[PDB]
Amino acid sequence: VRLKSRYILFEIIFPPTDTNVEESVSKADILLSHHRASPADVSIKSILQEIRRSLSLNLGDYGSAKCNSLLQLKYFSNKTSTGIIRCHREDCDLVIMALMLMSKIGDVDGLIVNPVKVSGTIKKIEQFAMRRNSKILNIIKCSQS
Amino acid sequence: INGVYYNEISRDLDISSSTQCLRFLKETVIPSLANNGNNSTSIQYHGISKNDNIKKSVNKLDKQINMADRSLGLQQVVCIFSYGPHIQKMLSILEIFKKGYIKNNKKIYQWNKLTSFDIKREGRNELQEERLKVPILVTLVSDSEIIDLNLHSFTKQ
Amino acid sequence: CTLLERGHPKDNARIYQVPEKDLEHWLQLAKGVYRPNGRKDHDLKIPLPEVHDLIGFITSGTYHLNCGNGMGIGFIDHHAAIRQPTRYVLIRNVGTNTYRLGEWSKISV
Amino acid sequence: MLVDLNVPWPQNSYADKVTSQAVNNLIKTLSTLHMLGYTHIAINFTVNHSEKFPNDVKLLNPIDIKRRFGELMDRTGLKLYSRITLIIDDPSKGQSLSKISQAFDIVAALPISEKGLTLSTTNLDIDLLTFQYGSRLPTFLKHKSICSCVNRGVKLEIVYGYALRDVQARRQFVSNVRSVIRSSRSRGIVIGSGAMSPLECRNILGVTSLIKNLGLPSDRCSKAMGDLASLVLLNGRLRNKS
Amino acid sequence: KRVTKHPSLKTLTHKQIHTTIFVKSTTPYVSALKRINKFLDSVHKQGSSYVAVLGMGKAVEKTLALGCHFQDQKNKKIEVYTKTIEVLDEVITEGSDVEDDDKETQLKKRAVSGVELRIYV
RNA sequence: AAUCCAUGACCAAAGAAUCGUCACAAAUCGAAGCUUACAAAAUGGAGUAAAAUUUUGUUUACUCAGUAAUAUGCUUUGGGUUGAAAGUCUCCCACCAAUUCGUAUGCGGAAAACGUAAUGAGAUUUAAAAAUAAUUGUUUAAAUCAACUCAUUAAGGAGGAUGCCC
RNA sequence: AAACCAUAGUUAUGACGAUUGCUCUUUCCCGUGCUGGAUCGAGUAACCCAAUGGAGCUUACUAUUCUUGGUCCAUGGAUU
Ligand SMILES: [Mg+2]
Known part of the structure; x- marks a missing residue:
């Protein structure tokens, strides 16, 4: 009767996996060392192919066929590592579990995929992204002192 | 009543006792915001509590404005300070003194500053803590317009 | 009667009086009972009162938008008002079987 | 608020001395947990039931959160707690809980055999029951024991980390967590x-x-x-204090 | 002696009322934070510069608390001003079982200290 | 012909309610609200305790508003919402002692290509529906009933006649 | 350059758990019967969804794919 869509916001976080280098313990230092940057070999068709492979490997044949009907990456840029994937409201939990089960990129290792906000509209997703970006600047300004 | 923090540094203070906090404010927070060494100012400090008499405080204040020498070329500044619920009585005493002094066709020049103490208390659950903030108002009143004190962080009134 | 906790009133509501044996439970609920998580706790068993506790009826019950709670306009008996040593009072709907707690204030009209 | 209760300590025995690299890796993983968003952290330390317990009280916990993590606690703003699991196989080399219950905060168990489950459900002052999700379960999770140990207050702990280790143990972990969900009837399920x-x-x-796709509402x-x-x-805090 | 207190004269033109929060003695802290954030966002589309925060009497303490919160939390310039507020009080003068509400009235002025707190963007 | 039982056809009404739960000094699939600033402690508040001072006055240490507020919490509700949100249907959402439908016209109604009441008639041979403005899969009737269309009946008071309880 | 305004408001109204009530069928009981009580079960539907607000009309709905009231010079059986 009405096509119900639901977008998922996900972020790529790189943990400082280095035991030979000691790290500073605070809020903004770990926020900066976790939000450093995404590598150059990052694209939309390269992340969609990887998540499709992971979904087909973890769920199966029908589990990937039911979710791959409306599985698209609407907006994503490698500068901040925030992407918005479109999916249905029935298979949203399956897409979240697939994002959780994302092991690694074909060339880049040691990364975590974190789903932050999920909703059925893009306007509220953009509003929450702007709110999160504004909140990020506060700890930065406070720690620069 | 777990701890007192100022300038992200833990201090040994008590909110219920006024003497210790007033002496701490007189000795630490004021010299770090105003320097009386490289200027020509004569600063008279005064802390206001809620148990002090308003008329007696005004009788202290109208005298503290004409105690220093006039031959030395001194700008005489009075630093009134308080914290917590005593700020209401502090403001009342300041406004009554202003009303009593401006009547003689004079002007009172004032600079205000607002900072905060950070205290911690036990929250609703045993695994949660609450962070309370206690305001601190510092006013500098003087009869002269120009003061060589570093008062850029204040507000002109 | 103003609702001091979770609940929504309606017109033609019943006004019951708090009993004497279950007097500390409502006082603790009005003071506060939280979960180990931190949020409030309303998921408990309700001490259903007796029947002979009707003291009033709410005529104009609508969610008060000026304070953020449920305002109840009722009319209680003076004898039962002097009977209780507290200002706590229970509100119930006509179809709902739940009892909300609140406090009433006298209006000089 | 979120709570994690299964952070393992890189040390199995008591003769095992800690390494600075292990402490650095633990600091890294705790910082990552706080980065993803958490409030309560409870690091776990594993020990064998066959190993000899020390004749000490001032040395039962080789952690000492106050001297090691006490700076992270007031800097980043989280908390740490003590938890110990018991790898129990058979009724031997034991009969001591009153001295291990006062030092640590949470006491867990790891039964791997037939009699281990019976002794865990009989007279063990434990809080959580943990199974080896990586390898096969001991015999079969039944309702007769699980219902009886949940009705008293002991919950079942599920480790979603063991799945992300390799590819082959994923099947065993799934087949075990679904059996635990079917046997426990979805009441006393805690995750770490x-x-x-x-x-x-x-x-x-x-x-x-x-956990929703695996069988839990x-x-x-x-x-x-x-x-x-x-x-x-x-x-745990209450039984530690009093 | 019976005496009632009316509010103080408020003369707001069209927009001084909009970008101004009057902190009551029963006003919660978080609701004040929320309304202050809404005012701070809506000011530059209302066409003002600052957000006025006015409180007198018992609410002065938590008004200063709200001020010092946004002072360092969001790093926004704050300005505190000490003002006087005149309030009219209606009292009964002495000069039949009659209700005390319907009696002779006399107006009296009372001055109170108050704090105005402006917050920049 | 009366009553009862079962089926079928047609007309009319309605669209069960209540409770609890979902991380981030902010969040949620969302939304609103907790702002006519005061505890008569500002007619330069009310008192207690110590020193000194020939009392006033002054310097320290405290009490009183207690039904007290309790820090991103807290309360509410969210697809027929006036039973159809659906539909290329109609109309109101500025006035006009009047080139402005100055329309006392069956009743109600601001209007309505709007509801209903009494009587008579009608069927491409008809005022008009079919086999040379909107809507509907069937899309009024054509033994009787039921349904559609059109043609008449201006409001109030008084007198006489008839029918019913009386 | 705003007039920004909904006891839903811009196509959002999500995820399950628990309780009461209704239809028929399965059985028991007091006193034939009772808006009777208690289990053993199923069902709680279909038509369809707002985008500024209100009224009128028409058109879709309710077959083990929830219900209710009445009527019938409709037929079927029985008594007078
Ligand atoms: Mg529509």
Whole structure:
């Protein structure tokens, strides 16, 4: 009767996996060392192919066929590592579990995929992204002192 | 009543006792915001509590404005300070003194500053803590317009 | 009667009086009972009162938008008002079987 | 608020001395947990039931959170708690709980045999029951024992970290967690992350979706995880104090 | 002696009322934070510069608390001003079982200290 | 012909309610609200305790508003909402002692290509529906009933006649 | 350059758990019967969804794919 869509916001976080280098313990230092940057070999068709492979490997044949009907990456840029994937409201939990089960990129290792906000509209997703970006600047300004 | 923090540094203070906090404010927070060494100012400090008499405080204040020498070329500044619920009585005493002094066709020049103490208390659950903030108002009143004190962080009134 | 906790009133509501044996439970609920998580706790068993506790009826019950709670306009008996040593009072709907707690204030009209 | 109760300590025995690299990796993974968003952290330390317990009270816990993590505690703003699991196989080399219950805060068990489950359900002052999710379960999870140990207050702990280690043990972990969900009837289910590397920790949404697709309803996951973790922390702190 | 207190004269033109929060003695802290954030966002589309925060009497303490919160939390310039507020009080003068509400009235002025707190963007 | 039982056809009404739960000094699939600033402690508040001071006055240490507020919490509700949100249907959402439908016209109604009441008639041979403005899969009737269309009946008071309880 | 305004408001109204009530069928009981009580079960539908507000009309709905009231010079059986 009405096509119900639901977008998922996900972020790529790189943990400082280095035991030979000691790290500073605070809020903004770990926020900066976790939000450093995404590598150059990052694209939309390269992340969609990887998540499709992971979904087909973890769920199966029908589990990937039911979710791959409306599985698209609407907006994503490698500068901040925030992407918005479109999916249905029935298979949203399956897409979240697939994002959780994302092991690694074909060339880049040691990364975590974190789903932050999920909703059925893009306007509220953009509003929450702007709110999160504004909140990020506060700890930065406070720690620069 | 777990701890007192100022300038992200833990201090040994008590909110219920006024003497210790007033002496701490007189000795630490004021010299770090105003320097009386490289200027020509004569600063008279005064802390206001809620148990002090308003008329007696005004009788202290109208005298503290004409105690220093006039031959030395001194700008005489009075630093009134308080914290917590005593700020209401502090403001009342300041406004009554202003009303009593401006009547003689004079002007009172004032600079205000607002900072905060950070205290911690036990929250609703045993695994949660609450962070309370206690305001601190510092006013500098003087009869002269120009003061060589570093008062850029204040507000002109 | 103003609702001091979770609940929504309606017109033609019943006004019951708090009993004497279950007097500390409502006082603790009005003071506060939280979960180990931190949020409030309303998921408990309700001490259903007796029947002979009707003291009033709410005529104009609508969610008060000026304070953020449920305002109840009722009319209680003076004898039962002097009977209780507290200002706590229970509100119930006509179809709902739940009892909300609140406090009433006298209006000089 | 979220609670993690299964952070493992890189040390198995008592003769095993800690390494600075292990402490650095633990600091890294705790920082990553706090980065993904958490409030309560309870590091776990594993020990064998066959090993000799020390004749000490001032040395039962080779952690000492106050001297090691006490700076991180007031800097980043989280808390740490003591938890110890018991790898129990057979009724031998034991009969001591009153001295291990006062030092640590949470006491868990790891039964791997037939009599281990019976002795865990009989007279063990434990809070959580943990199974080897990586390898096969001992015999079969039945209702006769699980119902009886849940009705008293002991919950079942599920490790979603063991799945992210390799590819082959994923099948065994799934076949074991679904058996535990079918036997426990979805009442006393607490979850923890048994990861030692900062690359195997996830957020609340992914874990919730995983446990929902694995057989647990969305109400059970949230309510159980949150309130039961808070309640086990509370009763542990209470039995530690008094 | 019976005496009632009416509010103080408020003369707001069209927009001084909009970008101004009057903190009551029963006003919660978080609701004040929320309304202050809404005012701060809506000011530059209302066409003002600052957000006025006015409180007198018992609410002065938590008004200063709200001020010092946004002072360092969001790093926004704050300005505190000490003002006087005149309030009219209606009292009964002495000069039949009659209700005390319906009696002779006399107006009296009372001055109170108050704090105005402006917050920049 | 009366009553009862079962089926079928047609007309009319309505669209069960209540409770609890979902991380981030902010969040949620969302939304609103907790702002006519005061505890008559500002007619330069009310008192207690110590020193000194020939009392005033002054310097320290405290009490009183207690039904007290309790820090991103807290309360509410969210697809037929006036039973159809659906539909290329109609109309109101500025006035006009009047080139402005100055329309006392069956009743109600601001209007309505709007509801209903009494009587008579009608069927491409008809005022008009079919086999040379909107809507509907069937799309009024054509033994009797039921349904559609059109043609008449201006409001109030008084007198006489008839029918019913009386 | 705004007039920004909904006891839903811009196509959002999500995830399950528990309780009461209704239809028929399965059985028991007091006193034939009772808006009777208690289990053993199923069902709680279909038409369809707002985008500024209100009224009128028409058109879709309710077959083990929830219900209710009445009527019938409709037929079927029985008594007078
Ligand atoms: Mg529409």
